[PDB]
Structure formats: structure tokens, C-alpha cells
Ligand binder design. Structure first.
Ligand code: CL
Ligand code: CL
Ligand code: CL
Ligand code: CL
Ligand code: ZN
Ligand code: ZN
Ligand code: ZN
Ligand code: ZN
Ligand code: ZN
Ligand code: ZN
Lengths: 160, 159, 157, 162, 150, 142
């Protein structure tokens, strides 16, 4: 009687926590998650994109375009990376579904996170992503693309 | 806003079930998740051998002549590991109702509520003693009823 | 004539501003708990390990990547990252922008005490007020009993 | 004067006298690298369950009428009695060599050393399991050899003639 | 026999006192929070990193110029709204530390020096600052720790 | 022309002194860790709860209050060189360095005993020599 060979390994596990957390998002157009892990391979912070604490997802607007900027989500929304850090984390790594914008890059650096592991870099050519890479390069923060062993993971509550 | 997002009860129990998938135990995979009053996760655990103890030398079987040739003298339950990963005033989501030994730890850690998926062994001495201890310590417990039976995580969904 | 706690903490925020290497704008911030301990201090600048003269400080340029705005960190962000702060109050020179407002709310800060609100009618300021209103974070203008405070190191001798 | 190892073991033994267990009293003391006491424990019922309602007896018709299902060992209580954040890297002084269930806790807590006075149950299965886990995990353990066998605490000593 | 919390805490203070290398006085202190956790332990002695040199110079410029008191050491090892168990009623300097530490109660075994100026000054400081002090009355005078007992 | 850390921290010490209701003298102290974070601030005054008391001994020094207000390996910035009682507190707290502005009571018994204790225990004491002589906080600047 020996150990399992088919268990979930730690890299897929941490990114899966990020993607699971993203499913909590009330944003109809974008759901992103983040997971911060320390040198002990323990999770120290988790976040998803949404409105700030105490603020109703049925009181602030979710639309991406409007005549007045104040009628869009952008003045109000918190990115997954911000929420994970606000949930020390110095010498840690962040698993993220999407390469961080430059504003998140600032927080990541000031939080003392030394490594960002991303699933998608879909907006690589964006100003936001270009500024983020430059900040990480100057700060000595690693960023690398996650290459998963599997494309999907099933949580079955009836397995118990 | 979306009207199909993952709600927090299902999320916290999903975290416990995901963590259980890391277990090297061939017969039982159990996870637990501790959550504070701000609805933040403060601890996650699954069942396994202690830190630095190889899953190859230590036995995984459930029965043998000598108990030292079974997993029971060596294995750490999900609840222990969740706690060892303060937690005073928190809630614990766990796939299986805690044993009495886990109940002791849960009480001494200051956990106030236990939310469980399965109570398979309700009539066991372990579960019976666990309930009494919780009753006396003022730790409440309740069965979790999922909004659905499965959750799929797709890493390609971001693309 | 002794300095009061609020004057002291606003003084610490303004003092902290003088640490800034921004050639055009110097801003400071101080975070305090209910026991009147300073829990965080911040000033505006580039992220840790950066602008060793390398990132731009200019306010206008051909494209925004040549300006400081994609790179610079506000005093409020740095104060929060400079040491939890749940149940604390933040002393700021200027009313925080909506981006700092998000961070303040998520940090669990419950009170912002500001000197100036000169951009009150801006979208950034408006969004900040709305978010604080919804999150239950109060904000009040600081009324100093003294406009100036002099620190002379030779005063002791 | 009392040296530090004798002192920390004496705190463990003194703490055991807090126990309401009428047949066995065990104490444990957790100490960090600066010789600061970071946790103290003794054997007892869990928090909120100590008001002389649970059974202390060792034999009965039914196991649920004994102490064993309910009692917390000293090591468990010391660890749970202050994770000032944590007790990682600390040493535990305990009256008896820990059982294998306490071994699990001690390992997962990040304790690096166990100093014990008695190993009277060393030929036990539980003791063998404990040693295996400690040795595998890299937790060092050593038997305490005290400079003296008895320590007297006297409240009159502050007022009395030396 | 069985020890109640107060006897246990005073016993920790007295046990700690035995670590002292001071030949003239051995004093201990034990600081306890509202949940009966020990948050600080101290005994009297010389400063950290120290026959100490220059003693005659220090004496001329008390007979104990270098000593650090049990109460000072317990506080430095710690204190919210705690209680302090101490073998000997605190002096006036220790009273200030205890007040500034936030300690609300001092439980003392000996008040040998009640009529001293230090103790009088200490009582006044405690009364001004709202810090309770009360004399501890033990059951048995002696507690024996026997390492063979297991 | 930006303020550097040492001047900043001594300025905080001097700013803290102005919290003092003591009409005779005002001293301040600021404790800093190796990451340049303020971890404790103090000024001289009456014990907690006793600021409305006058008693024609009672006073708590800046250094004591800074340590009580929240430090092993830290540095303390102080407006005045510590007395011997504060030196004991500084040593037992594990503070490694005292940076002082004034030592105008150097030949006193108190300051001499303090130096002796710091010498025995290996606490470094450093005369602060500031770049700028004065700093002005201007609330109307915003
Ligand atoms: Cl793009
Ligand atoms: Cl940009
Ligand atoms: Cl805006
Ligand atoms: Cl066994
Ligand atoms: Zn972002
Ligand atoms: Zn269990
Ligand atoms: Zn801002
Ligand atoms: Zn045990
Ligand atoms: Zn004293
Ligand atoms: Zn002094």
C-alpha cells in the first residue's frame, strides 16, 4: 500500500487557487485572481477583482464605457493583485491569471514581492504592461509565464 | 454584475476540497480551510505526513499486524495542518466532521464554528466525543449544503 | 504652549514630505492607531530599488511612458506599505485620489485627516468621497492652531 | 544560582502542578533562541470544558466515560498557549518524552529541539513512532541531566535570614 | 499539591529570582495578561553584556549603581492591562516603568520596606495613576519541585 | 535639497519634544529599526493619567516613554544624552546605538554613569552633527 501518484502538485495548486478566487468576481467582463506564497510554500494572501470592502456590487457601476468616467467601473474597481496584498509578504511570489498592470506593479514592488508568475500576458504591448515590465526590471522582480501540467481541475463535492 | 459568480460558502469549501487534492494518501483525501470574521482565509490544510517526513518510508495502509505499519501513528489530519498553517474567533470549513483529537485542537486554537460536508461516522466514539467537546466549549457546527456539486477550474479561460 | 496630537501627526506628515526626491511635488503621509502610535509614514517617490536617476520625473511628454505618472507612488500608498493598519487614521496634506482611496479602504483605515481639498470638484476626489462614504471611512479637514513649526537642533543647547 | 536549563525544566514541572488530573501531571515549556519563555502548558481538558464535568478516570465500561477522548496533553497546550505569531525554531522542555500525537504537533509547529526528563515509556509503540517522526523531521531530542534533583520554592525566602 | 493561578504566578516569580547572581538580593517578577498568559518574566541583576569594572567610580558618582531590577527586566522581556506578581514591593523607579507599561495591578509577597521613602513614593505613584496593589497571601510557604517525580 | 534619514529622525525626536507640557525642559526620542522604520517615539512628562497633576521623582523621560510606546538592534535618536536610568532601559531593551544632539551635561555624574554602562554593555553612542541647522514645517504650504 503506497502513496498516490496522481495528486495535485504545488505549482498547479497555487495557480488553481488564483483561478478559483477569480470565479468570485462580480465583474461581467473580467474575472482575475491572485495568490501570494512565501518561502515555505504557504499561501499568505489571496485576491480577486472587485469593488472595495463595504461597497455594493449593486451600487457602483460595472460598465466599461460611458459619457462620464464616474459612470464606469474604473474609478472604483480594485484589481486582484491589490486585494491579495491588502489581504508581511516580503520575499514572496505572486501567482496571477493576468500579467499585472503598472499600478499593481508598484504595489507588488513596495510589498517586497520578488517574483510574479502569470498565466496570460495577452496585453504585452500595452503601455500599462510595458510600464509594469520596466518597473519589475529596475526593482529586480522576476516575472515568468506559468506552463501548467494540465488545462483544467475539477472540484467534486461528492467525492467525500 | 454577473449572476453566476462563486459565492463565499461554496468558495471556502471549494478551497478545502482543492487543497485535499494535494494529499498523497491513497484512500482518503481531506482538506480544511480557516476563515476569520472579515471572511479572509487564514489557514489551509490537507491530510499528510509531518513536514520533512517522506511519503515513501512511512506506511500508507489502513491495516496491518503492527500499528507502526499503518498510517495512523504518523499522519496529520487536515484540521491540524490548517491550524498549524492567531485563529481565535474563526470558522473552519472541513470536508469531514472533525475527530475528537482535531476537536481538542480546534477548541484550543479558539475556533468558534465548524462547517462540514460529510458526517459519515456520526455514530463513532470519535465523532460523539467531538460533538460533546464542541457543545461544552461553545463551538457550533453545521452541515454545508452546496449550491452545486462540481466546480471546474480552467487555466485556458483567461485566454 | 505645547503641540497637540493632531498638529504633531500632521507635522510628521509634512516633515516626511521633505524626504521626497520628486523635483516638482513633495507629499507626505502619516498613519496613526487609536493609542496615538505612529504606525506608518510615507512620501511620494519611485518604487523601492528604482529611480536611481533612471525613471523620468517630468509631468508632460510625447507619450505618457516618458512622464513620471506610470511609475510614481503616492505618499498614501507608501505609508500603508511602510508598516496591520486596521482601525487607524491617516494624516495627509492633500485629500487622497481615488486610487489611494481604494488602498485606504482595503487597508482598513477608518479616518482620513486632510489639510487641503483644493481638487474637490475633480472626478478623482469625487470618486474618493463616494468610496469613503460607502465603506464607512470618515474624512475631515484639519484646522491647525499654528501655521508654522520650527525645528532648530541648536534649541537644545 | 539556578542555571537556565534547570530553570526551564523547573518551569515545566511547576506548570504540571496546575493540572487537575488526579493521576498524572505533566508540564511543558517552550523557549526561543534568546532564552525567553514563549509558551507554557500542562495536561487538561480543553478551554471551556475544565469545570469538573468531564471524567478524569482511566478505566470504565465505556471509553467515553474515561479521560482519554477529551484530555489535552501538555505539549499541545504549550504550543496553543502562545504562537506569538509562532514558536518556530524554539525548544520545548517537557517532563516526559512526547507521545507520537504530540510529536506531530511539535513538528508542524516548527519546534527544533525537545529536552525531556523521563523516557519511562521508551519501549512503547507510541515512543517508537515519536522518535521516527522527530528523527525524520530533523527535530533533535535529548534527555535532561539536572545538576540537582530537587528545587524548593519558598515564599518566605524574601523575608528570612540567609 | 494542586496550585491555583495566583500561587502558580507568584511561584514563577520566586523561581525566576533563583536565576539571580546578586549575592545581596534575589527578586523575581512575573507579568500576566487577562487570559492568564505569562507575558513577561524578570529577575534582578546586571545589565546585558556585563566583579563589574569601575564600581568605586560609579558608587561615588549608591552601593548598587549598575543593578537592573526584576520589574524592569520583566517589562523589557514583555503589556496592555496586565498584572505583575513580584516578590518584593516595587521601588519608585520601577513604579514609573510599571505605570508606563500599562500594568493595572501589582501583587506583592513582601513589603519589608513599607516605611522606606522609595516604597512610600511608589505607593503614591500607583495611587495617582490608578494602579492597584495588594499583598499576596500564600497557602503553603513552600513548593518542592522534584525531577524524579515522573 | 531633500532631508536625509538621520536628519529626518532627529527632527522627529525634536518634533516629539514639543508634545511636552513640562515647562522647565522638553526632550524627545525616536527609536528606529534597520529598515528605517520608526518603531517608538517619546517625550518627557508625567506618568500615564497624571498630566493634570502638580506636586510641589514623578517625571518620565523621553527615552523611557519611547521604549514603552513600542526593539533589539534598533537605534535611538535623542535630543539630549541619556541619564543612567535611561541607559539601563536602553541596554535592557537591546538598543544598539544612541544618536544624541546635545551632551551639554557630559561631566555630570549621571552622563558619566551612562557612558560607563554603555561602554560595559557595548551600546554605541554617537554625537549627531546635522547638515541643516533648522527645519520648518509649513501647514500653509499645501
Ligand atoms: Cl494589447
Ligand atoms: Cl501606463
Ligand atoms: Cl476618476
Ligand atoms: Cl503507535
Ligand atoms: Zn492592476
Ligand atoms: Zn482529526
Ligand atoms: Zn493618490
Ligand atoms: Zn502527547
Ligand atoms: Zn525597582
Ligand atoms: Zn533619563
Amino acid at each position: 500500500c503506497k502513496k498516490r501518484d496522481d495528486y495535485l502538485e504545488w505549482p498547479e495548486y497555487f495557480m488553481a487557487v488564483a483561478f478559483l478566487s477569480a470565479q468570485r468576481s462580480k465583474d461581467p467582463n473580467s474575472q482575475v485572481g491572485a495568490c501570494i506564497v512565501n518561502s515555505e510554500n504557504k499561501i499568505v494572501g489571496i485576491g480577486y477583482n472587485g469593488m472595495p470592502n463595504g461597497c455594493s456590487d449593486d451600487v457602483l457601476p460595472w460598465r466599461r464605457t460611458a459619457e462620464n468616467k464616474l459612470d464606469t467601473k474604473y474609478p472604483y474597481v480594485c484589481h486582484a493583485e491589490l486585494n491579495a496584498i491588502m489581504n508581511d509578504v516580503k520575499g514572496c511570489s505572486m501567482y496571477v491569471a493576468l500579467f499585472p498592470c503598472n499600478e499593481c506593479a508598484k504595489l507588488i514592488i513596495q510589498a517586497g514581492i520578488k517574483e510574479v508568475i502569470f498565466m496570460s500576458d495577452k496585453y504585452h504591448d500595452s503601455d500599462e504592461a510595458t510600464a509594469a515590465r520596466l518597473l519589475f526590471n529596475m526593482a529586480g522582480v522576476t516575472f515568468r509565464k506559468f506552463i501548467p501540467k494540465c488545462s483544467k481541475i475539477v472540484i467534486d463535492f461528492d467525492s467525500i
